[PDB]
C-alpha cells in the first residue's frame, strides 16, 4: 500500500532563519544573502533504487530562469529517512533580485519514475519578519 519511494519532505537548512523552513511532502521567506541548503528527505522501504536524481526549476513571475539537476545516488530500503542536501548557497541580495521565485522540485530516478513532483515558492526579503 505505500511506496517504495516516498519524499517525505524539503527544508531549507538555514541557521539565520528565526524560524522553521519544512515543507512536509507526505511560501518560503529567506533573507536576502543568507547560506542555506536544500534538503529533500526520503524514504526507501523496501527495493534498492539507482541514479536518484534532484530536478529543480526555477521560475519568476511565470517565467523560467533556471534549471538544475543534482545527482542522489542510489540507496537501498531502510527504516530511518534520507536526506539529499544541496550544495550551500547564497540567498540573491539586491532589491533587482528581491520577490517570490517558483520552484518547480522533481525527484526521479532510473526508472523515471515520478517518485514525486510539487511545486513551492521562495519570497527572498530585506528582512526576516
Given at each position: 500500500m505505500v511506496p517504495n519511494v516516498v519524499?517525505t ?17 507526505t ?16 524514504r526507501v522501504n523496501r527495493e ?29 530500503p ?52
Amino acid at each position: 500500500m505505500v511506496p517504495n519511494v516516498v519524499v517525505t519532505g524539503l527544508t531549507l537548512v538555514c541557521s539565520s532563519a528565526p524560524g522553521p523552513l519544512e515543507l512536509d511532502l507526505t511560501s518560503f521567506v529567506l533573507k536576502e544573502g543568507v547560506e542555506y541548503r536544500i534538503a529533500i528527505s526520503f524514504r526507501v522501504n523496501r527495493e534498492i533504487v539507482s541514479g536518484m536524481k534532484y530536478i529543480q526549476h526555477t521560475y519568476r513571475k511565470g517565467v523560467k530562469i533556471d534549471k538544475t539537476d543534482y545527482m542522489v545516488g542510489s540507496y537501498g530500503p531502510r527504516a530511518e529517512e534520507y536526506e539529499f542536501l544541496t550544495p550551500v548557497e547564497e540567498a540573491p541580495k539586491g532589491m533587482l533580485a528581491r520577490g517570490s521565485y517558483s520552484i518547480k522540485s522533481r525527484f526521479t530516478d532510473d526508472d523515471k519514475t515520478d517518485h514525486l513532483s510539487w511545486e513551492w515558492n521562495l519570497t527572498i526579503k530585506k528582512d526576516w519578519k
